[PDB]
Structure formats: structure tokens, C-alpha cells
């Protein structure tokens, strides 16, 4: 209920199929009262451009907060990683108008709350090391009731405006450019003798924000504590000496285009694969698509491929990714079956997915592997050479605003989506660790 329009949940419909139902339930509850019974009872850090890191001046921008929620808005040194939250470092210096507190290395109550559609603002004096916050013409005071919000911050690597929205919110900033149409800089500001950013410039200040899409990246030395090693037979061993143990994905650095195999040793449960470079899924899941041929009608025409990434699972798990143009799977001398032998001309990152149970979690490497992968390709003894990395899928990195997108018109009769004026990139792509930047 065929194709009857009753394909609905109950709460989503109108107040027409609810009248008789709720009234008969009230009548049954009145039989109960006639019997005497009563029923008693995540982030988009939007920040400005690092080359605009102002370092000696008197600056201000006024931030419209629009809808209530996590709105942490203020200044930061450029080392604010988007992955960890705001305020809980020595690098973020911002004010949270919701719940009336300001952020640095934890909590400190400050100021007030904000009406849904007001324009907040944040001053900086670089010279005299004071960083004032405003709201709607009223200088926001302390709990002590003093104007100077943050004091004696070090002028180091400059300061950049930062807005950290929450879950389902809207923010709006103000980046100079617009001298007559400044909202609350004209009240406090101009008379005191401050300047916005873009009184001088003739651009729009290009912003950066974090992406939801995770991309891999090296293992820097200042990680939590994860130490890949470089041991040479020809091991890259491991360790995860922390308490933080969600899931750490691992990609080896360079792909294979479309003979030699490759041994993964497991010390402690553990997945091994061959990532095609478009794998950006960071969860505790097990997921990724079958295109079929056509013989101008089909009718034989089925088996092409599936790929996306690749699946395996006493003493040591000595699992081995044997290659080629296809793939197979062997492990610990035996041959773990159900191999995904499909690659037309793909690139494949040798990869491993695991949760940390211990330190010393992995080791890496009837011939062997490296000489099918580098430039010199007899080179039959394997060896590691210093381009090799042990990448980690990190959740977020900042990404460019793309100051113009497309001139676009959507319409009504026929719904004329319409774009006419072309725009082009300037887009490179690094070839060795395949991904595209502009």
C-alpha cells in the first residue's frame, strides 16, 4: 500500500490521519480514568590564509554568528591542526559565545551569550599584547569585569582569523573590503583607531577549511607515539606505544601499475590489502561495484571487475600479497583462497589495517619485490630505498576555498540548470603517490 500513497511513517504526515487515532486512544485512556487509572511518570574550522599572518598592527574582524551551537571564533597562530579541537593547545586563542567562555588550554568563563543573528568581533593589539573581544558594540568583559580578554600572548608566527562551527550551524565573517558596510566596527573601532584587514587589498582573502574526506600522509616524528622503523630482511617494523588505540590504517608509499610477492608479518584481527588510491573511508567498518560487459545486448557479457579495498585476516601471521596481470593471496606458506584477481590497468597501494593491542605490531619486506616497483628492474635482491613511507590515513587537513566556482543559474520550467561561462584549474598531480593538487 499497488502504489498507494500510504508509504509513510506516522510522525511525518499531516494532522488528518491522527485525529481519530489520538481520539480513540484518549477514549481508551478515559476508560482507564473511568476505571481510575492515570499514566504518571563534526568540525569545519574555517580560517584565513597563512600569508595574511598579521604580526605588528591593530586589527579587527566582526563575525556574525547566526544559528546557535558550537561557535568558537577568534584568532590563532597558524599551527592549529584541524584534527584536534580548538583551544586545547597553546596556539588557538578564540572566544566561544555559546556557553560564555573563552578557549586557551581548557576553559575560562568570559563574556555573555549571543542572540541568533548578531555580529560578534575580535580585536588584536599586537604592540601592546592585548587581544580584545567585542559583541554588538558592547566590549565583552571578564568574570572580573575587565575589557582586556587575553593578555601577554607572544607575537610569534602571526595571527589568523579562525571560525570553528559545530554540527548544524551557519557562520558569517567580515574581511575588510566593505568600509561603509561594517556592522559594529563603526561603533567601536574607527573612533579608537583600528583597521580591518582588507581596507588596502584588492582581492578576496582566500580561506582554508578542513575536509571530511581523509587523506593519507607521512608518519611525522611528533606523532602521538608511533615509530615506524627502517631495518636492514629489509624490515619496516612498528610500535604503537600509546593508550589511544582506535584504528591505525597503514599504506605503503608507492603503487604498482598493470610477478613478485611481499610478506607482512603479524605479531598479535589484522587486515591486509591493496588500496587503489581512492580509499578515503575511516571507520570501524568493512565495505568498499560490478560493471558488466555488453555484447551489444549482454547475454554472455558479465565478468569485468569489482575493485575499490582488499581483504584478508598461531605464532605469526606471515601474510603475502602475491602479484600478477592479476592478484592472488597466500599466507604463512599456505594459500588463503578467494583472491580478487582483477586489475585492468590499476595502481595498487600495498596496505594493512589494524588496531593496536601491543607495541611491536608489524614487520614488512620465488623472488622478491622492490625491483618490480622502482626504476631499475632486473635488480633481483630486494632492498628498501629512502623514498619508502608508511603512511597513515589522517582524518583532516586544510583545503583551499577556490575563490570563484562557476556562474550558475537553476530554473523552474524544465528546471534549467544553466552554466555558460567557463572556468579552468591550474592543477598538478604528484605522480608517485597518486593524488591531485592544484
Amino acid at each position: 500500500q499497488r502504489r498507494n500513497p500510504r508509504l509513510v511513517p506516522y510522525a511525518l504526515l499531516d494532522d488528518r490521519t491522527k485525529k481519530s487515532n489520538k481520539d480513540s486512544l484518549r477514549e481508551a485512556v478515559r476508560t482507564l480514568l473511568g476505571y481510575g487509572y492515570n499514566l504518571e511518570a563534526r568540525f569545519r574550522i574555517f580560517r584565513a590564509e597563512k600569508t595574511y599572518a598579521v604580526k605588528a598592527g591593530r586589527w579587527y574582524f566582526e563575525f556574525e554568528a547566526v544559528t546557535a551551537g558550537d561557535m568558537r571564533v577568534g584568532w590563532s597562530r597558524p599551527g592549529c591542526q584541524p584534527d584536534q579541537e580548538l583551544g586545547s593547545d597553546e596556539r588557538a586563542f578564540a572566544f566561544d559565545g555559546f556557553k560564555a567562555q573563552r578557549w586557551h588550554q581548557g576553559n575560562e568563563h568570559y563574556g555573555r551569550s549571543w542572540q541568533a543573528g548578531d555580529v560578534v568581533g575580535c580585536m588584536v593589539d599586537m604592540t601592546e599584547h592585548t587581544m580584545m573581544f567585542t559583541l554588538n558594540g558592547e566590549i565583552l568583559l571578564d568574570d572580573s569585569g575587565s575589557e582586556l580578554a587575553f593578555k601577554d600572548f607572544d607575537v610569534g608566527d602571526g595571527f589568523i582569523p579562525v571560525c570553528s562551527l559545530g554540527v548544524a550551524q551557519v557562520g558569517r565573517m567580515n574581511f575588510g573590503k566593505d568600509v561603509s558596510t561594517l556592522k559594529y566596527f563603526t561603533i567601536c573601532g574607527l573612533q579608537e583607531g583600528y583597521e580591518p584587514f582588507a581596507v588596502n587589498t584588492n582581492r578576496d582573502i582566500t580561506m582554508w577549511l578542513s575536509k571530511r574526506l581523509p587523506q593519507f600522509l607521512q608518519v611525522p616524528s611528533s606523532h602521538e607515539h608511533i615509530e615506524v622503523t627502517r631495518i636492514d630482511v629489509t624490515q619496516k617494523s612498528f610500535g604503537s606505544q600509546n593508550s589511544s588505540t582506535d584504528i591505525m590504517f597503514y599504506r605503503l608509499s608507492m603503487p604498482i601499475e598493470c610477478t613478485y610477492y611481499y610478506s607482512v608479518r603479524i605479531f598479535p584481527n589484522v587486515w591486509v590489502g591493496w588500496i587503489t588510491s581512492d580509499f578515503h573511508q575511516y571507520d570501524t567498518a568493512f565495505d568498499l561495484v560490478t560493471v558488466t560487459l555488453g555484447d551489444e545486448k549482454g547475454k554472455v557479457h558479465e565478468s569485468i571487475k569489482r575493485s575499490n579495498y582488499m581483504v584478508c585476516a598461531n605464532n605469526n601471521g606471515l601474510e603475502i600479497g602475491c602479484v600478477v596481470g592479476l592478484l592472488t593471496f597466500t599466507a604463512n606458506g599456505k594459500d588463503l583462497s578467494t583472491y580478487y584477481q582483477v586489475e585492468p590497468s590499476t595502481k595498487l597501494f600495498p596496505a594493512v589495517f589494524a588496531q593496536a593491542t601491543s607495541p611491536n605490531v608489524f614487520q614488512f619486506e620465488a623472488g622478491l619485490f622492490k625491483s618490480e616497483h622502482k626504476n631499475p628492474v632486473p635488480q633481483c635482491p630486494p632492498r628498501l630505498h629512502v623514498q619508502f613511507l608508511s603512511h597513515v590515513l589522517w582524518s583532516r587537513m586544510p583545503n583551499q576555498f577556490l575563490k570563484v566556482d562557476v556562474s550558475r543559474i537553476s530554473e523552474r520550467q524544465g528546471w534549467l540548470v544553466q552554466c555558460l561561462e567557463p572556468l579552468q584549474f591550474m592543477s598538478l598531480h604528484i605522480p608517485e603517490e597518486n593524488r591531485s593538487v592544484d
Partner: protein
């Protein structure tokens, strides 16, 4: 220098590589979709080279969970059918892309996207196969057996002097295969908007406003009913309140202007169950009996411990 630019240029791996690429844009008509589903498009103008580059028209479907469709901040170059959260189709020589795959299974025209083309597209409910028709002709089916996870929608991408007609409701030409139109999710309250497909911007003279991400269905999943145990001291009052409910159901049709009769009708105002709670047999009154029983099971299950404090009538 000849030795340098023989041994170091053409491999294109050691140093980088760069070129210019046309700004892809994809647009979806505000209809999330968990019957079968179906839509159309017709093309108005292509202008196939207003760039020094082949301008693309990807037509098809996409999943939702995950899925940041960002211009230049997604996969390689910006595209459609490039991640596995995407399934699209259409070329000059119309072959698909699904995960940046180029497989060129033919059509009974080997047609372009010219300015006079009809693209019929269908998605199957729970038999996860997608098939595309050009001008009513089946186009040698390719798509099978996907991850049915997250919702679905049409995506269609374009980057040129390109304008096309949605046929979603002003339907113009639509074959019926399978069947249910895209018009079957505008039913309860919702509207027919078409958006930029997910917008970390929204362009403006002053300031583009910002966007915290999202908070992310017609299978009915209520609270369970029958697996609730009734003590018999509640069951006495339950049978008496089912009697009270049946006599109020008699009083309801007395108020609404009905009459007792042997004919089970609603067109001549004759109703055969206006007699008492027990004088109706247990194949017409048991639907009220078990209704009152499960109502008191829910009242003992919804955390409202209604004790016996008065007389039952």
C-alpha cells in the same frame, strides 16, 4: 641538455606534472532516496569546446553516507563516477564512469551528447542494478550489485556552456521500465528544489556563509508489542476495559449516525457490531480485545507504572 631531457622528462614520475582542467560542477534535486526509482534528462545546448578541453556530461546516481562532493577537493581533477559513492554516465560516445573507470560498451547510435538527446535512467529497489536508456533504446546494461548503504539521488555533472532540462515535476518524455517516477518523494510535505550538491560555499559579495556538516527512510520500525507479560490481576481490569472500549465503540457509531443491521455496510448505515463486548463473537471483537490488551502492555511498558488506585468500571 639533450641527455637531461631524454633521461628525465618522458617518464613523468620523478618530477611533477601539471596541466589545466575545467571546473566540474554537479547538481542534485533535493530528493534523498533510501518502490523503484526513475528520471529523465534532455539536453539543450552543449557547445562541446568552450575550453581547450573535452567538456563532460555525467548523468546518473550516487550514494550519500560519506560523500563530500567538493570542487577540486575530492578525487583527481574534480569529476563524477570517480569515487565509489558515485555512479554516472555520458560521453561523446556515451560510455560511463564509475570509480574513474573508462569502459566503452556501445549503444545503437554511438551517439554524442548532442543538443537533442533523451537520457532515461532507472534505479532498482533492492535488486541493485542501474540501467540507462538513450531515446528508449536500452544501452547494453553494465551496472550490477552495489553497496546499498546511504540514500540515493540523481547527480548530473556538467562543466561548459551547458544547460539541460530536468524532467521531474514538467515531465516531457518518459518510458516506464520497472516503474515509479522521481515524483514519488515529493508526496508528504517536501518540495522540488535543485541545489549545487553540498556547498561548502555560498557565493556572495560580502562573505560566503559557512556550514557545519549534517545530521544524517520508509521502513517502519515501532516499539515491539506482543512480547510483554500480563499478570492476571491486570488482565481482569484489561478485559473490563476492553468491554469499556467496545461499548465506547458502539457509542461512537451512535454519535456518528449509524444503525445496527445484519448487513456489514458503510453505504446504507447498517453495522453488525453494535451489540455488547461478549455478544459479538471472537472474530470481530477480538480486534478490540487484543487492542486494549496491547495498549495496557504498552502502558506497563512505557515506564508509566499505573497502579490500581480506584474502582474499575
Amino acid at each position: 641538455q639533450h641527455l637531461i631531457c631524454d633521461n628525465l622528462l618522458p617518464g613523468r614520475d620523478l618530477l611533477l606534472q601539471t596541466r589545466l582542467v575545467n571546473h566540474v560542477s554537479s547538481m542534485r534535486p533535493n530528493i534523498f532516496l533510501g518502490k523503484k526509482w526513475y528520471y529523465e534528462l534532455m539536453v539543450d545546448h552543449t557547445e562541446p569546446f568552450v575550453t581547450a578541453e573535452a567538456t563532460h556530461l555525467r548523468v546518473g546516481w550516487a550514494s550519500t553516507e560519506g560523500y563530500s562532493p567538493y570542487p577540486g577537493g575530492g578525487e583527481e581533477w574534480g569529476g563524477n563516477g570517480v569515487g565509489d559513492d558515485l555512479f554516472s554516465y555520458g560521453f561523446d560516445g556515451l560510455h560511463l564512469w564509475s570509480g574513474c573507470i573508462a569502459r566503452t560498451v556501445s549503444s545503437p547510435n554511438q551517439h554524442l551528447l548532442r543538443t537533442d538527446d533523451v537520457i532515461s535512467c532507472c534505479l532498482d529497489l533492492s535488486a541493485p542494478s542501474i540501467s540507462f536508456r538513450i531515446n528508449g533504446q536500452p544501452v547494453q546494461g553494465m551496472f550490477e550489485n552495489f553497496n546499498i548503504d546511504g540514500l540515493f539521488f540523481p547527480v548530473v555533472s556538467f562543466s561548459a556552456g551547458i544547460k539541460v532540462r530536468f524532467l521531474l515535476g514538467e515531465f516531457k518524455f518518459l518510458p516506464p521500465p520497472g516503474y515509479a517516477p522521481c515524483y514519488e518523494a515529493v508526496l508528504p510535505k517536501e518540495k522540488l528544489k535543485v541545489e549545487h550538491s553540498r556547498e561548502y560555499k555560498q557565493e556572495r559579495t560580502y562573505t560566503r556563509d559557512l556550514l557545519g556538516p549534517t545530521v544524517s527512510a520508509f521502513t517502519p520500525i515501532p516499539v515491539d508489542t506482543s512480547q510483554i507479560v500480563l499478570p492476571p490481576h491486570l488482565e481482569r481490569i484489561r478485559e473490563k476495559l476492553a468491554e469499556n472500549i467496545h461499548e465506547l465503540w458502539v457509542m461512537n457509531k451512535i454519535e456518528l449516525g449509524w444503525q445496527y443491521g445484519p448487513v456489514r455496510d458503510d453505504n446504507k448505515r447498517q453495522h453488525p457490531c453494535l451489540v455488547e463486548f461478549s455478544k459479538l463473537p471472537e472474530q470481530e471483537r477480538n480486534y478490540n480485545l487484543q487492542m486494549s490488551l496491547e495498549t495496557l502492555k504498552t502502558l506497563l511498558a512505557l515506564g508509566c507504572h499505573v497502579g490500581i488506585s480506584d474502582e474499575h468500571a
